[PDB]
From a paper:
The pentameric assembly is radially organized around loop 8, a folded-over edge of the barrel, making a chamber at the centre of the oligomer. The pentamer has a central chamber formed by the association of five loop 8 peptides that is open to the periplasmic side of the bilayer; the chamber is effectively shaped to the dimensions of a lipid monolayer.
Having observed our original structural information from refolded PopA, we set out to interrogate the native folded state, using our existing structure to inform on introducing an internal His-tag in loop 2, referred to hereafter as PopAhis. A final particle set of 365,835 was subjected to ab initio reconstitution followed by non-uniform refinement in C1 symmetry. The resultant map at 2.85 Å resolution (according to the gold-standard Fourier shell correlation curve with a threshold of 0.143) allowed building of a model with correlation coefficient (CC mask) of 0.87. The central chamber in PopAhis also has density for alkyl chains, equivalent to 11 DDM molecules, two per monomer with an additional one at the centre. The cryo-EM structure also retains density behind the helix of loop 2, and we were able to validate the x-ray and cryo-EM attribution of this to palmitate (and thus potential FadL-like role) by demonstrating high contact residency time for this ligand during simulations.
Author numbering:
A (entry chain E): 1 to 83, 98 to 344
B (entry chain D): 1 to 83, 96 to 344
C (entry chain C): 1 to 83, 95 to 344
D (entry chain B), E (entry chain A): 1 to 83, 97 to 344
The structure:
Amino acid sequence: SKARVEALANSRHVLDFQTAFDRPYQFMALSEQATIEWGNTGDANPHAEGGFVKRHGDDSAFGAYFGRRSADFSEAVQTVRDAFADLMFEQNGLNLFYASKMGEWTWGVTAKYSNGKNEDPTVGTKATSAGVAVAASNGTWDFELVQGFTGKSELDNGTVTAEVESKGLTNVTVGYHMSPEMEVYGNVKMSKVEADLNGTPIEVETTSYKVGMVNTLAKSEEGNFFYGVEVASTKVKDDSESLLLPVYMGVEHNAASWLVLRASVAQNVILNETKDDATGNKTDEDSTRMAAGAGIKFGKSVIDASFAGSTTGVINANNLFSQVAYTYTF
Amino acid sequence: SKARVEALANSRHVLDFQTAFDRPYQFMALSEQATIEWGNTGDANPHAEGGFVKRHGDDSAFGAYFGRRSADFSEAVQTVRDAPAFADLMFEQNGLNLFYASKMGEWTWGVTAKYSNGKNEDPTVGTKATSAGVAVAASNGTWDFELVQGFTGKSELDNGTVTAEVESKGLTNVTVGYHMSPEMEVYGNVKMSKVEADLNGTPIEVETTSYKVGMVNTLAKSEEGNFFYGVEVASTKVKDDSESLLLPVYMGVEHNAASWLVLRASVAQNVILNETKDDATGNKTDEDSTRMAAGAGIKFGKSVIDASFAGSTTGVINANNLFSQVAYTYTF
Amino acid sequence: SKARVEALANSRHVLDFQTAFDRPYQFMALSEQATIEWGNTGDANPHAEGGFVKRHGDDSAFGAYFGRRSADFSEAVQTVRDANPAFADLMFEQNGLNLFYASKMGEWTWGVTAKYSNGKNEDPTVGTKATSAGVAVAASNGTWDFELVQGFTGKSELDNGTVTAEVESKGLTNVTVGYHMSPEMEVYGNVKMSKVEADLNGTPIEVETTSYKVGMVNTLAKSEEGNFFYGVEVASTKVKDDSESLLLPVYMGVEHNAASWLVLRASVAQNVILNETKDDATGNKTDEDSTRMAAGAGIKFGKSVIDASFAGSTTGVINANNLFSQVAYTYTF
Amino acid sequence: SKARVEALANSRHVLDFQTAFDRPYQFMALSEQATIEWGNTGDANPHAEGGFVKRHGDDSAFGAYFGRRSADFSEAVQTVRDAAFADLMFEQNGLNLFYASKMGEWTWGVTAKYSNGKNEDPTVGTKATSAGVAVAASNGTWDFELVQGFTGKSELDNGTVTAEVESKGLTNVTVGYHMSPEMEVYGNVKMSKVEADLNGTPIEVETTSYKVGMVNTLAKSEEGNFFYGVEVASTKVKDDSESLLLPVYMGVEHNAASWLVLRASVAQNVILNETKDDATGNKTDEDSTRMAAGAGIKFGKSVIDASFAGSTTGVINANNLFSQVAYTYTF
Amino acid sequence: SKARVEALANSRHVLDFQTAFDRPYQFMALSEQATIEWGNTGDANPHAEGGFVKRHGDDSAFGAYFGRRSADFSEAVQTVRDAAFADLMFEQNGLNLFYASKMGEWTWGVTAKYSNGKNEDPTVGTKATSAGVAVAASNGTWDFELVQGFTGKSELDNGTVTAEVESKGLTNVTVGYHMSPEMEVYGNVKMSKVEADLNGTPIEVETTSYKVGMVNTLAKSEEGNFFYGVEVASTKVKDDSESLLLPVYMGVEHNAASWLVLRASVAQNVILNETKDDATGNKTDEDSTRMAAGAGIKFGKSVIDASFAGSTTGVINANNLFSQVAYTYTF
């Protein structure tokens, strides 16, 4: 579930449905599951989503997913939106994926398609998205690749013209497992997007690098206390430049026969500076953050959620569970 | 209940008391039970309803229902209401529902009769509203036939200042269902409806014809858990401006979570075919279509309380948003 | 409790403390118990009430009850009250007191219930008085029931420095018969008369109301954890020079011992076919929607039971801001 | 617990920590326990309170209590507050010390109350003080109780207005008899006198009251006891008011489960409800029926007593679950 | 858990993560664990914090903590904000490193603290640096704790106004003696000077404290333990005020069930409660009664410590169940 992955701070060691859309070899290592994320139909948060994964024999896995929305697309559309507020997100997200085991190497591929339009004279919107993700794994080595083919969103209504177009989206990840407890990974991500607000052309170009590590402090059953160090440098051309060292630690515990408790804390240690270009001014604010969540188990049914009141520290009837998901494991 | 079937995407494989009204042969296969839908009297949502079904012998069933309202009648009355001069047009007042079913050899068949009559003769409301109909269906384990015919329906308003009438000029619904496997089925139906209205001397005609073909496959269905999915092609045409070809693809599960809990969830989308054209021009609309529904039923033996998670559309389970659309069922 | 009787559709088969006030032979069939209805003081809904019933020997019962307010008295005061609320001080019953006795004379159970109420406010600003008295006599054979209710007096006065308004009951009869052909089948009939006169600064108001009722109560499903009842009734009403009504309410409901700590009750009713109310001068008619439902739960703790009604009954919502209302507490000895 | 005593209609048959302040011979019957009342600091409601009682040997008991406030002091200060006078002090830092011993066949106890506080800032200028003792003895069939307030004051020198409330007497004699372990009869005489200087306008009240009553148990059980009680109470306020009442109550405290106690009661003034005004002769007789309820969550040697917050509106919902919470630990 | 140490009135007898922060010899006596304190990021209350403690052998221990904020800093910056000046920076990205070791018969330990932040944006222009250490030792009967602060600057230079705070010293020495496992005494001296500059106008604050007190257990039990303590506190703010208090408290922590722990306490300033102004000479004696409650839900190795939100009003309802929640996972 999304809440499960968030409560563990995107630990990069977590095996989940939501973490396999970019690592499709994990669809072979997962179990047969059906998953639904609670939410609404329009452009609301959270959005309704759902899918399934099944095994074709004993060496293949196939499945589909409804309503997934990209982050690189929704973020750019949101950026252009408040700068015209009728530009469109991914309309009918369609994800197909497949994975097989060729000997000792498992490999997988996921495909994403989306299309929607509105031809009313007062609402001139249309949106199209497409991309693929290919990954192969060995158990000791790990390789992933994410490619975006097309991305577009136009609004031509009543003398107002707006567009956002994806000019490329690359995402390469390499992982190495020195042991079944410790692993090291690296990542390079380029993203060039160009938009027209009303004859005004704007172009952004994002470059990211990532080197990390995930280990285990407490080696136990019931739960494992995990910890991770990471170095991240993000360069946005002619806008800003960042360099962070996020350190996180957390645990996932089978508290009861009906409860799973997830918690983590993170903070950028020593390195938290985001220098702003064309000015030279830096920014080093507080960055300590936490996430908490619960998973209620009824045999083959699990309701993952996050504690709604963790941010204020308060948990009561009015703030109990938010970001709910349901999973059925055949 | 209206929440058990809504949480299960209104599938054609579900057998409830709320599905047996248009499939009267299903009252013989339903367990003897009494249902109460919680709500308030009058133009309220949700409305209050309830009924029963009892077996008269070894091959027969009968019962009655209270307060059930028609979707087409309500839709027509609502579309006429939004024309404040005519926000008194009445709904289906009261509402009586009788049904009967039997087993003639290997074919089981059933009938369902609907009636309604309301009146408000005060000189400043002048409202009157009536309705009637019938639904006949027969079914062997393999072949399923359903015909729905609405004889009449009216809603007149006359308060000495304005006048509004809505009339049903025809409503027929025929469905065919085939069962290859006890876990696979196909169906198709035709829906024809004509509504005549008059808003203070402005005669209006509304005509709708619908087609739909489909499949419901229940893969991985056990005695503790039932996974299913279905595909369907639905075409709908309004005489003047509306043609819509859609491909609804849904999936969902009903799981016996515990001895006191049953969890139901579903997700649906319009895959590829999500197009609705307007006839006046050639304006086509392809907007978002992902939706989900969740619900639960608390089992206390012969008593079950079914509801829908109120926070489903916001994704929250708290005590301020816990249950909605509650109904109480008692299995004799 | 009031909640329990409400969620069972004021069915004439439910034996409860609240149904035995007008059927005083039923106090010999109840167990020994003490009940407290939650509420506040004054003209507040729900009002505070409570009382007990104890067995005196083995063939007699007795008890008392605090705070019971009539329906006719409250209604008659309310119509004048809501007539610039110049008459907003008219007092309802002030301090209710009931004394009931029941004895088993041979095979016939018999019982009497007495009602007294009195209160006043002699402040010149608020010159209010209120008095009421009545009795209820009933007997039962097991198959034959006879119940008689009489209102000896009832009056509510108000004399400010400016206004002057009083209401007064000039009679209130309520004869009722009942036959039991089977432990599931029973039929009954009821005749009711009520004259009310009011004064509004010298303008008399008169209200005469006559009622007739015939109905039956039967069982569609018999169990041991919970039976299943239904009823059909014919109700005719004639408010002199105002309105006339004939109705056919039909109800159906259930009480189920869901667990060892739970009792679930629900019901639904509607006036089938015969829904009709006619005005007298205009001659007009009204036949609108009449589908009502009632739900409630009783939490059992052994000798203590908390009876409530689901507050989300009219909205279909069992949330926490809306879980239990109309709470009452009953201690059974 | 205050919620426990209120839910049971303040009857004289209840043995609670809160009923032993005015009957200090009960501190030897109570088990060794510590009580904390949830609340805030200051002129709040409820107020924070806490104390303990411990056994000193085999026939003695002692303890202390924090934050207790007197009903008469609060009422006298409130009467002046609601009639630039909203800064009058209540009892501040109230201290109670008690002791009890068994003198052969008799049990006797003493409690002492002290409360001092001040605020000498020029724009407030308030000072409050209090003192009193309560001596009681009991045998098992006879109860003798005497409460004697020694001092009580609340001044106010705002620099623009002046005020001062003073106690000029307090007397509470109470004799109780036990016609049986079940039945019990009591009597009570109370005298009080409060003198105030409302910016140069001397206001004086003089309260005289007598109570005769009984408490009886008509249903006997080992899970819970059902009780009722009748009482005649006369109250006279010199040159102002006169009231005669007959408050009748009934109630029960039941151990429903191994983790739950349930308390409920109902009361009403029967036949005698008249309050006569001694300035015009006009009387008053309105509605008296009242109810209270509460619960206790027994988690072993830890019990949390509370009152159902929705009793007045008859709603047990999550926004109106519990109120007047108090935690009790038994050593 | 902050809400635990708060429900026990910050008693010296408790062993927790923060009590170990200021007494590093306790990290060797703490069980291996990791704790996360729920909250938000930035100048928010509660703040998000978390850390762990692991054993390096059989006689050593170490760990780290994220997001801890010192109270002296959070009070000086707050009073400067209360005197525009709303952008003054609190402690940013607080880091804590601890080491403990059972050297011989002694058990020492050291805690280090560091924090740094900035905004360098011309219309905020903020900066906040902090550094300090804490050394302690204990052989079982004698405790020696020392707390020293090195840097405490916190600036603000936007276009118009110019604020500034600085710490010119912070020393805290405490000595404790343990006569029995139950009774303990302690003495503590703290001297801290804070010099601010509010837009050229200089402000100087000097504080000196002297605390001496005892902690004993009134009742003795296995699941719970009823404790109490008496303390004398004097505080002389140079040429601003002078106080002398006597805080007395009592409380308990009960293993109510296998899934529940209940904690509560009550406190008051008995007899000595005075605060005298240095210039005017006036004194204030106001109400000082207070209580605290909290719960800990045990799930085996995971414990959810919370503070009863409705304690200050005496309610337990939907909106007032838990607050100040933290999560602890014991390895």
